[PDB]
């Protein structure tokens, strides 16, 4: 559920 955004969004955290 913190696994749906791999790809660029992950970058924001």
């Amino acid at each position, epitope marked *: *559920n*913190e*696994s*749906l*955004n*791999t*790809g*660029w*969004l992950a*970058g*924001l*955290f």
Partner: antibody
Amino acid sequence: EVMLVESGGDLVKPGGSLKLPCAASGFTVSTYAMSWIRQTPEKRLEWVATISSGGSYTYYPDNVKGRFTISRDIAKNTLYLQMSSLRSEDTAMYYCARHPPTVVAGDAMDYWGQGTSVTVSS
Amino acid sequence: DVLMTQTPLSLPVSLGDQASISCRSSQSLVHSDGNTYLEWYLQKPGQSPNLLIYKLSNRFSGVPDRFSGSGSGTDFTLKISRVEAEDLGVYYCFQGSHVPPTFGGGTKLEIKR
């Protein structure tokens, strides 16, 4: 269908404060990554804040960092934007947006609300 | 912050024609994972923007046909073949690669008549 309705916009004095809500219908907030994005009177779109699909992480670009807070209330199925210490440069339309899984739309934003309008002025 | 420079802010184009909006980035938007997080949005008058293309060359659900994302590295092209009344609005390019994510200034699609 999927619908996001921002509210809370208003005129406030510089250095003031206010909270935007954004109410989701059509999907659960607790299962999506969500951002606030603003559009200035001159149509320039700039990033405001983001919350992780699982709700444990937050981002703010440097110009709003430390003054703004994005929160979500999974029970209310509503996204918030607490805005403090406001500057006239913050005057813009505040859109509320969701990001589907990276498998669906390469972390892009599929739905955007209709905006609430904020004016920082004395 | 990566400058997203786009804006011929118009192109004049008659219905049923080609249309090519360009977008140039400050630097290469190729992610450390060999992706291109370049996106295209259309804002129709009095509306929020709508997603058209994500990841450089990927058309979103329901997003027509005549919409196509081409480009690489620093230069990008959204390309509308045909051109319908419904395509009117402002197109933005968008960069997710570099850490303050940035928009273009938008190109308005002007309809000839």
